[PDB]
Tab-separated table of C-alpha atoms and ligand atoms in Angstrom:
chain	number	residue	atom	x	y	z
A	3	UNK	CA	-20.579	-69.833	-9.466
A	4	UNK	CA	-20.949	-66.136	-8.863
A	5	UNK	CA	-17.718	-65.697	-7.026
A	6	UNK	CA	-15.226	-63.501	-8.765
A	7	UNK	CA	-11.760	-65.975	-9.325
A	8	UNK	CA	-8.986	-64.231	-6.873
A	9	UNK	CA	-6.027	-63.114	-8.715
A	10	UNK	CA	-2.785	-65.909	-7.877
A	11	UNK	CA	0.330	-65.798	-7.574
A	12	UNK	CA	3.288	-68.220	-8.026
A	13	UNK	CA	6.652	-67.657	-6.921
A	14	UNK	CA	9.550	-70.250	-7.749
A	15	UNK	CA	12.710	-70.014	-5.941
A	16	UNK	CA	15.516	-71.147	-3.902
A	17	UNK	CA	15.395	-71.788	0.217
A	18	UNK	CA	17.601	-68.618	0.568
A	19	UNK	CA	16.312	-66.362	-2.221
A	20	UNK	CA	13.354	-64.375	-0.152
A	21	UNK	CA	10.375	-66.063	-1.269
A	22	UNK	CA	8.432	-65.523	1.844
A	23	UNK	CA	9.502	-61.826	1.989
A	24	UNK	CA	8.648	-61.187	-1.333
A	25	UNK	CA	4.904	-62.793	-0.825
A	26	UNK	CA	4.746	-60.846	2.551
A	27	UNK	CA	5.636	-57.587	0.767
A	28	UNK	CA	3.643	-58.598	-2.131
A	29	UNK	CA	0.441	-59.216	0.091
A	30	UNK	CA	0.938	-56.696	2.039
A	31	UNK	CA	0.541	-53.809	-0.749
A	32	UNK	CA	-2.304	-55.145	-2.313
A	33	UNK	CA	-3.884	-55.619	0.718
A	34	UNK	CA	-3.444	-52.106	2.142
A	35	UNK	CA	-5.354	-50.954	-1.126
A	36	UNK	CA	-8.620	-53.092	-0.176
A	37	UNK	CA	-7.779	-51.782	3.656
A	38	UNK	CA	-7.325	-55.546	4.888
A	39	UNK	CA	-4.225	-57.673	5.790
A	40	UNK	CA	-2.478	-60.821	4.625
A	41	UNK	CA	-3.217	-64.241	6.305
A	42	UNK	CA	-0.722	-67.124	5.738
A	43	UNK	CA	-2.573	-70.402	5.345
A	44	UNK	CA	-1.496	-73.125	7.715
A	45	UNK	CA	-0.228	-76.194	5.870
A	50	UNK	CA	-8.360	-72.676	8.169
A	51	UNK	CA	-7.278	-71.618	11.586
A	52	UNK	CA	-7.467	-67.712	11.767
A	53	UNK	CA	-8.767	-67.101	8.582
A	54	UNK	CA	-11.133	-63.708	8.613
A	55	UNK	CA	-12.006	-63.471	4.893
A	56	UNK	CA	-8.554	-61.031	5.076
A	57	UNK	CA	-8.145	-59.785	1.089
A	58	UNK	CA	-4.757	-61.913	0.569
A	59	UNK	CA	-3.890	-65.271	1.740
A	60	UNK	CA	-0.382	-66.804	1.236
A	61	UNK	CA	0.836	-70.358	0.621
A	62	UNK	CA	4.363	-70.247	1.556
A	63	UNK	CA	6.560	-73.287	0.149
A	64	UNK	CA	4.369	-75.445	-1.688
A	65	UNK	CA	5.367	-78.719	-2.073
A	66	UNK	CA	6.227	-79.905	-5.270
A	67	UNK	CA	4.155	-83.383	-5.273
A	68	UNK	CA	1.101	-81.746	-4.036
A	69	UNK	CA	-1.433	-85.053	-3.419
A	70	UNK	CA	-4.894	-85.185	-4.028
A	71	UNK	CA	-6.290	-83.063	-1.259
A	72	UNK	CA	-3.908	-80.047	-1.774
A	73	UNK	CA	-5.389	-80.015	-5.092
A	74	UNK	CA	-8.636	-79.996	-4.422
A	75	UNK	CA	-8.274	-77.341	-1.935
A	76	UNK	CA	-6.446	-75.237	-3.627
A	77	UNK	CA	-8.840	-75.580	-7.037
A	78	UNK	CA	-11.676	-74.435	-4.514
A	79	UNK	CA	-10.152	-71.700	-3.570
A	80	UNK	CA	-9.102	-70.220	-6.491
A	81	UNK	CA	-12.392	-70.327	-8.571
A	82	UNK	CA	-16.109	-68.864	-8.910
A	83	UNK	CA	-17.397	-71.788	-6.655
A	84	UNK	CA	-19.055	-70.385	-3.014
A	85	UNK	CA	-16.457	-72.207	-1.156
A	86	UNK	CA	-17.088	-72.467	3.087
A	87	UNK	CA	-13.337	-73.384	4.187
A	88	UNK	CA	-13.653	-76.540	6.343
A	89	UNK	CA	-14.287	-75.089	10.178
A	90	UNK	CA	-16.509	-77.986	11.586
A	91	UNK	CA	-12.995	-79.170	13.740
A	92	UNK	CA	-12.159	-75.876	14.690
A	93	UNK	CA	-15.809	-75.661	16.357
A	94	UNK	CA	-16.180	-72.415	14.424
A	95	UNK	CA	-18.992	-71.437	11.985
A	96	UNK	CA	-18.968	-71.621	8.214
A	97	UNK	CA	-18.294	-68.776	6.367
A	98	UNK	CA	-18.064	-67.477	2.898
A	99	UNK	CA	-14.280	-67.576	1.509
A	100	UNK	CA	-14.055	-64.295	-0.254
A	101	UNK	CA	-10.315	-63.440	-0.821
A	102	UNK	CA	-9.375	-61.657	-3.966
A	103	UNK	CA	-5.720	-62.587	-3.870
A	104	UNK	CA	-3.869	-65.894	-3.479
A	105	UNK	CA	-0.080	-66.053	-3.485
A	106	UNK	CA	2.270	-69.024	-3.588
A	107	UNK	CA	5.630	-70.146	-3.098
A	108	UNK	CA	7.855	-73.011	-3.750
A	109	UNK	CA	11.394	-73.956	-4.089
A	110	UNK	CA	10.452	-76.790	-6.842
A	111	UNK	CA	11.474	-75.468	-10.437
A	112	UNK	CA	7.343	-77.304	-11.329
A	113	UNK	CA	4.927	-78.620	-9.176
A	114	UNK	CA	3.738	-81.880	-10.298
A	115	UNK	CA	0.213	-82.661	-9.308
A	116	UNK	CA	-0.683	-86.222	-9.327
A	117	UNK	CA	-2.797	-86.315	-12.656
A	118	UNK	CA	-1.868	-84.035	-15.584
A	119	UNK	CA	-5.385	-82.602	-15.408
A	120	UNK	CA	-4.774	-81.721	-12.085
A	121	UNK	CA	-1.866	-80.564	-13.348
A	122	UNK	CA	-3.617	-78.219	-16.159
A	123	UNK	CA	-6.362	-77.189	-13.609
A	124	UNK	CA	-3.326	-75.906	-11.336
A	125	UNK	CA	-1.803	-73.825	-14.222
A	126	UNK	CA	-5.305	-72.688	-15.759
A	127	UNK	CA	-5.522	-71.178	-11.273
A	128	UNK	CA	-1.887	-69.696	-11.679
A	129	UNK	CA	-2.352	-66.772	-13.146
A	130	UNK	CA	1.206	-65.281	-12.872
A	131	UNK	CA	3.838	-67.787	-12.437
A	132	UNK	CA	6.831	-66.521	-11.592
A	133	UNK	CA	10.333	-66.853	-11.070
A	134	UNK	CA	12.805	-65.661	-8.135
A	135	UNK	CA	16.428	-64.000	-8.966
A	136	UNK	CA	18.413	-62.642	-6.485
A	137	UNK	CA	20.798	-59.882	-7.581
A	138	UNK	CA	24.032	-61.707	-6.647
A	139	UNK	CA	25.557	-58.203	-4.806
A	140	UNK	CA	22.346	-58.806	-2.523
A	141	UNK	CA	23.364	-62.695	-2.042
A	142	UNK	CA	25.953	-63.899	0.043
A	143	UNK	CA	26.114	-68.006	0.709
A	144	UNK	CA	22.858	-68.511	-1.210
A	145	UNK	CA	20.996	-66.365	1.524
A	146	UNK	CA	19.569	-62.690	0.653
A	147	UNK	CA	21.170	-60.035	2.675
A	148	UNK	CA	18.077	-58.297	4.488
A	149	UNK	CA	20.030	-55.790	6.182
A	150	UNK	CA	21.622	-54.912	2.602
A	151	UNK	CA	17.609	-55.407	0.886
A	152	UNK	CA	15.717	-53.681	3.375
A	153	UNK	CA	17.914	-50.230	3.119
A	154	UNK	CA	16.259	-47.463	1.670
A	155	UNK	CA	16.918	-46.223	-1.460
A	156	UNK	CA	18.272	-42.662	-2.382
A	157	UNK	CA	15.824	-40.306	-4.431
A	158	UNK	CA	16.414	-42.181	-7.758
A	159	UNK	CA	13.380	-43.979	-6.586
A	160	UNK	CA	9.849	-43.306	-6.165
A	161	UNK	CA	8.095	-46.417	-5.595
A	162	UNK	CA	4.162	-46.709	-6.706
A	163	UNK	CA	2.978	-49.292	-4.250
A	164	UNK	CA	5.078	-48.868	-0.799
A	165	UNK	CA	5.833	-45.236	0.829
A	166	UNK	CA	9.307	-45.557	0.884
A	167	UNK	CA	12.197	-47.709	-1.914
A	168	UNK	CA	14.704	-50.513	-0.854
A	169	UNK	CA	16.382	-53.026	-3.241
A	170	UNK	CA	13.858	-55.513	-2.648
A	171	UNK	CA	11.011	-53.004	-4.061
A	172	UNK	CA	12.573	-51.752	-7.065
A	173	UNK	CA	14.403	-54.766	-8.357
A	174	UNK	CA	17.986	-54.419	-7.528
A	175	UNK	CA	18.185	-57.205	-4.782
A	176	UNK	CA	15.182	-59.490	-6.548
A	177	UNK	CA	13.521	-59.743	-9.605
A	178	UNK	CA	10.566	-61.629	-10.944
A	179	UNK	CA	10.542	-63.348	-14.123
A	180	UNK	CA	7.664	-64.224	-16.427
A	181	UNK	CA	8.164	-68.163	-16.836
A	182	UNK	CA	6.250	-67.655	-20.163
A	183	UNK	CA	7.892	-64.765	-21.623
A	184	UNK	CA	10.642	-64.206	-19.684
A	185	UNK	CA	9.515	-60.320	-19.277
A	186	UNK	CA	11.145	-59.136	-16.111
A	187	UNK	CA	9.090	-56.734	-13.463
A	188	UNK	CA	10.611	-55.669	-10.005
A	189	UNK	CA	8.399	-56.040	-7.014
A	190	UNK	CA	6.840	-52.881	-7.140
A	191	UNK	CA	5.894	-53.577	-10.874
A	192	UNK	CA	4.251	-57.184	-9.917
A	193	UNK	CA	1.687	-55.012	-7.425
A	194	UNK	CA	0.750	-52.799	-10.592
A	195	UNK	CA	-0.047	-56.307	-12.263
A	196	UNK	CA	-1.518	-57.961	-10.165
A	197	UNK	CA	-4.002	-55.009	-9.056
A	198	UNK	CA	-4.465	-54.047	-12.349
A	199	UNK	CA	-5.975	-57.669	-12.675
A	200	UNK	CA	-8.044	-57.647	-9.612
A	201	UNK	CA	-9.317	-54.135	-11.372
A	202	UNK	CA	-9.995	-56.003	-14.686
A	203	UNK	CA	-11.899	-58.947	-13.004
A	204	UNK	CA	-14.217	-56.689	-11.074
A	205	UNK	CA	-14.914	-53.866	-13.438
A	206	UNK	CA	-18.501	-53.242	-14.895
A	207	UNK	CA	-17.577	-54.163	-18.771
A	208	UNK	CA	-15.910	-57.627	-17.489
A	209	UNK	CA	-18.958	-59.059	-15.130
A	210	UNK	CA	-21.243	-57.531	-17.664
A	211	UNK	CA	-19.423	-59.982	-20.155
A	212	UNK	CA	-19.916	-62.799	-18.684
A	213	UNK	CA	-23.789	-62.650	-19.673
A	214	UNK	CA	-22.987	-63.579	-22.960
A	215	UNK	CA	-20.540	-65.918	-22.307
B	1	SFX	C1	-0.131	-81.426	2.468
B	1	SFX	N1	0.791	-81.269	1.346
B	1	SFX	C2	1.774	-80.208	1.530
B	1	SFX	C3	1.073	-78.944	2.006
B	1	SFX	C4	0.665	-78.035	0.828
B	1	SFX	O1	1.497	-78.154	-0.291
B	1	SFX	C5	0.841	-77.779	-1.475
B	1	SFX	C6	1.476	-77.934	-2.605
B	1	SFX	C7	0.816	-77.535	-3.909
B	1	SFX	C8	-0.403	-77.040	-3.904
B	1	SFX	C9	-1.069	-76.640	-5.199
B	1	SFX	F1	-2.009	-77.566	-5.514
B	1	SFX	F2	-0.137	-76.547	-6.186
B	1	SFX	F3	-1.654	-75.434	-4.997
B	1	SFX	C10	-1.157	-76.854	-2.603
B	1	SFX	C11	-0.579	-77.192	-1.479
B	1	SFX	C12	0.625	-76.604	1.409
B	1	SFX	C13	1.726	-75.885	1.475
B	1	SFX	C14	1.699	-74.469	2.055
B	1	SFX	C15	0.577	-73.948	2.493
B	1	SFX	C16	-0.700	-74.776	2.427
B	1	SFX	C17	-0.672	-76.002	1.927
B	2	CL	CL1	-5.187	-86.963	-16.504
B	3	ZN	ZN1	14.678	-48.468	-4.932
């Protein structure tokens, strides 16, 4: 157990409301800052120990091997991805960052201590809103997302603004609290975490713990 937990993410939304942008975007920035890439698991092929890997549209019964999986994954446990198939050797899985989507409003695992061991792994848990000005038939408008903001906005985690950074066309809402960040803001939280987990005072911690 002397892995360091990656950070997770997960997104609840609707098929049209840009949950696979938003983890792209969202994976993207934090990856940048630990000069890697995201990799979007296949539901191991091409994984490369990249810093972020996305789960795009979870399913909300996950059964008994998604679960263990994903509990893998997202602990201190050395964890060697299952390669053996692939005829590819074993390596170390070593991301920092895991982020999820689904369209279910709650995943229900098939035990409720799977179902505690998934939420203890979720460390934000999130939901979508699309700004309705942004949303026509359900769908986001990319073209009207994706254009860049005037000088109102200075974003911290992208070079340049559009709605979708700054939280005019989406929005992401603590499930918890209900405290509201833009996407922009989310990358500040969830890097700030990553920062918490590996600092000095926090591993020197868990001596005494
Ligand atoms: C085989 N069952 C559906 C595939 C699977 O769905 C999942 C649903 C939930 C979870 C968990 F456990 F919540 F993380 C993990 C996986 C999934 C979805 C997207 C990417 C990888 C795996
Ligand atoms: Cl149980
Ligand atoms: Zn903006």
């Amino acid at each position: 157990k002397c892995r360091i937990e990656p950070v997770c993410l997960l997104l609840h939304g609707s098929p049209g409301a840009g949950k696979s942008v938003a983890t792209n975007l969202i994976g993207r920035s934090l990856a940048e800052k630990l000069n890697s890439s995201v990799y979007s698991l296949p539901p191991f092929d091409g994984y490369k120990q990249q810093a972020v890997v996305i789960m795009d549209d979870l399913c909300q019964n996950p059964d008994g091997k998604d679960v263990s999986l994903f509990c893998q994954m997202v602990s201190s446990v050395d964890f060697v991805p299952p390669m053996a198939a692939l005829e590819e050797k074993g390596i170390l899985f070593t991301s920092p960052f895991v982020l999820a989507s689904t369209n279910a409003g709650s995943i229900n695992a098939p035990t409720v201590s799977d179902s505690r061991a998934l939420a203890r792994r979720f460390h934000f848990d999130m939901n979508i809103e699309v700004i309705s000005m942004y949303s026509q038939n359900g769908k986001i408008n990319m073209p009207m997302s994706v254009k860049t903001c005037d000088d109102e906005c200075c974003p911290v985690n992208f070079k340049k603004c559009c709605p979708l950074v700054c939280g005019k066309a989406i929005q992401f809402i603590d499930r918890r609290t209900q405290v509201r960040y833009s996407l922009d803001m989310l990358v500040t939280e969830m890097f700030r975490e990553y920062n918490h987990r590996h600092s000095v005072g926090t591993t020197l911690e868990a001596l005494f713990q």
